[PDB]
């Protein structure tokens, strides 16, 4: 018929969208920004100050029985800025076209990363922890119990939620566990900009969202057995001690170090509990029939590790009223009581927190200076997690090419361990 | 007592000032600045004849 000129077209304004950008966890936690001149000399960290406990006393006479104060703190810092690096030459540049479009999936793959760290910290950092000993969907109410303890002992343990609690699902273990808790369903429908957010369900055993991510760790399962305490130590709640020039350095409220008698196979992020010890509520001081549970921050030697919260007797008889006051622990770590591993098995882990509990704490990278000339240097903001990074370009004449940066760097801290907490299935070994 | 967080201090304002040095002999000796663009052709060099015996 008609023999013509043949072209190829390529639709200008229709991008195929694939990837979605969904970042329900970054979302829930808290950003802070601190003045970056000081946060420049103090080592990129701050500390932050906890809200003190009172100790209250009952009569009229209270001669020779006021307390002292004590106000704990913890530290935020921030990690090795991520960001994304790519290179032009200069015909390339002529359309600009897939430049725009490469600036645009850095955005999205920084807040991925982003979701990412906050994901695996909380799954790393988390105290209490909720296992269940064979897969979620066996037996009856698997799923109920799954998520309703871990909303019981966040209740019970009294501590703060007034921003809300969460709790997220891996995908796979939702599918199991959704067949029960929708039946069990008080709240209505969603809004759809929360449910395409990623919220599933609402007011879940008194849980406010309960969330799916799908960037959850998989949690291995801890080789250490037969470890018990070596020797008797209680924790006292300090805002610093002395050192050996004899200067007050800030302790941090969590974070105790322990002596047990092997320190071989566990390693950073593995739950563990003492034989006899409970968790404590935190305003009535009374025994909660859950067992005290904590995760170890690092190993530091085979004889040592670093748990993330405090144990704080009660029944301490060292403790001052106001140290007293954030007791936490009904009892101290006796001379040799077994350390009972609650990383049985490899289990893909859920997270349940208190709303802020994690603080992702964000700097400027201020290469708008004079000392940087040959550099072109903007602001860059990536409005899906709320985090402004830098986006920076420097083309060389030898070769007619440009480099673009786009550097965004942030920190993920979990200020409240005791809040993040891990739900571990079909733990049995 | 009151215990709570420690702080560390710098006043970047107040600046120990320690040293002040005095430059007598490079103010007391000349300054000349030839042409650059002859000196470039010369190896940075100039030629001035002694008074004559």
């Given at each position: 018929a008609l023999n013509e000129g043949q072209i190829v077209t390529l639709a200008v304004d229709e991008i195929i969208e694939t990837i979605s950008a969904i970042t329900p966890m970054a979302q829930k936690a808290k950003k802070y920004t601190p003045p970056a001149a000081s946060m420049q000399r103090s080592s990129n960290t701050i500390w932050m100050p906890v809200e003190q406990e009172s100790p209250t006393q009952e009569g009229w006479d209270l001669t020779d029985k006021a307390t002292g104060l004590l106000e704990l703190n913890v530290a935020v810092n921030m990690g090795e800025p991520d960001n994304d690096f790519f290179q032009l030459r200069a015909?390339?540049?002529?359309?600009e076209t897939a430049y725009r479009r490469r600036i645009q999936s850095a955005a999205r793959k920084l807040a991925n990363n982003v979701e990412l760290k906050v994901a695996n910290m909380a799954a790393e950092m988390g105290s209490l922890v909720i296992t269940s000993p064979d897969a979620i969907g066996t037996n009856t109410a698997d799923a109920w119990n799954f998520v309703a303890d871990a909303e019981e002992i966040m209740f019970s343990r009294e501590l703060n939620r007034d921003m809300g609690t969460s709790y997220f699902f891996n995908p796979q273990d939702y599918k199991k566990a959704g067949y029960d808790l929708t039946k069990r369903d008080i709240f209505g429908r969603i809004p759809e900009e929360a449910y395409r957010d990623g919220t599933i369900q609402r007011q879940v055993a008194g849980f406010d969202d309960v969330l799916r991510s799908p960037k959850l760790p998989v949690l291995t399962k801890s080789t250490a057995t037969g470890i018990t305490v070596s020797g008797a130590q209680s924790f006292k709640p300090v805002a610093w001690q002395l050192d050996n020039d004899g200067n007050k350095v800030n302790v941090d409220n969590r974070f105790a170090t322990v002596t047990l008698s092997a320190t071989t196979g566990m390693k950073r992020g593995d739950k563990i509990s003492f034989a006899g010890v409970k968790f404590l509520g935190q305003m009535a001081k009374n025994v909660l029939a859950q067992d005290a549970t904590f995760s170890v921050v690092r190993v530091v030697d085979g004889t040592h590790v670093e748990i993330t919260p405090k144990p704080v007797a009660l029944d301490d008889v060292s403790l001052s009223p106001e140290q007293r006051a954030y007791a936490n622990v009904n009892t101290s770590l006796a001379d040799a009581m077994a350390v009972n591993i609650l990383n049985v098995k490899d289990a893909r882990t859920n997270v349940f927190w208190a709303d802020d509990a994690i603080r992702i704490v964000s700097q400027p990278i201020p290469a708008n200076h004079e000392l940087f000339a040959g550099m072109k240097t903007t602001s860059f903001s990536i409005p899906d997690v709320g985090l402004n990074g830098i986006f920076a370009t420097q083309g060389d004449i030898s070769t007619l090419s440009g480099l673009c940066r786009i550097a965004l760097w942030y920190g993920v801290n979990a200020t409240r361990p005791e809040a993040i907490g891990v739900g571990l299935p079909g733990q049995t070994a």
């Open positions: 015909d390339d540049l002529r359309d």
